[PDB]
């Protein structure tokens, strides 16, 4: 999983921000969202989302679909650590199981069901 956000912001600063934002908003989780490599989907200008821990993956799909103006017939897949997360999972559960060492959760989105194809 390569994220441009991690190229743009050194780890030491990401970790400091993640620690502070979890203390400030403990009922939310910090999520970095980016297009998967070679996905044919519109860009997402906003990459930083503070998501209620109880929000479902399905609710988050609905939000991102709207933000990138998908047509009804367009597909959308999420990837976390190279795997599609269950639609019924909460974002807090995904965070607990997959956050990186900077305390952020990284989600890639794509029109393909295989990451980076």
């Amino acid at each position: 999983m390569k994220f441009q956000y991690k190229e743009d912001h050194p780890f030491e600063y990401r970790k400091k921000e993640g620690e502070k934002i979890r203390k400030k908003y403990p009922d939310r989780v910090p999520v970095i969202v980016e297009k998967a490599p070679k996905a044919r989907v519109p860009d997402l200008d906003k990459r930083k989302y503070l998501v209620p821990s109880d929000l479902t993956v399905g609710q988050f799909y609905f939000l991102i679909r709207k933000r990138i103006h998908l047509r009804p017939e367009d597909a959308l897949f999420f990837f976390v650590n190279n795997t599609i997360p269950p639609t019924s999972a909460t974002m807090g559960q995904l965070y607990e199981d997959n956050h990186e060492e900077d305390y952020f959760l990284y989600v890639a989105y794509s029109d393909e069901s295989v990451y980076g194809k």
Binding site: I21, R28, P30, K46, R47, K48, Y49, L50, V51, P52, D54, L55, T56, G58, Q59, F60, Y61, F62, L63
Partner: peptide, 13 residues
């Protein structure tokens, strides 16, 4: 940049 504050209990279809 700033965090987007996502609202609770939104739609899903």
């Amino acid at each position: 940049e700033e965090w987007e504050m996502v609202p609770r209990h939104s739609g899903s279809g």
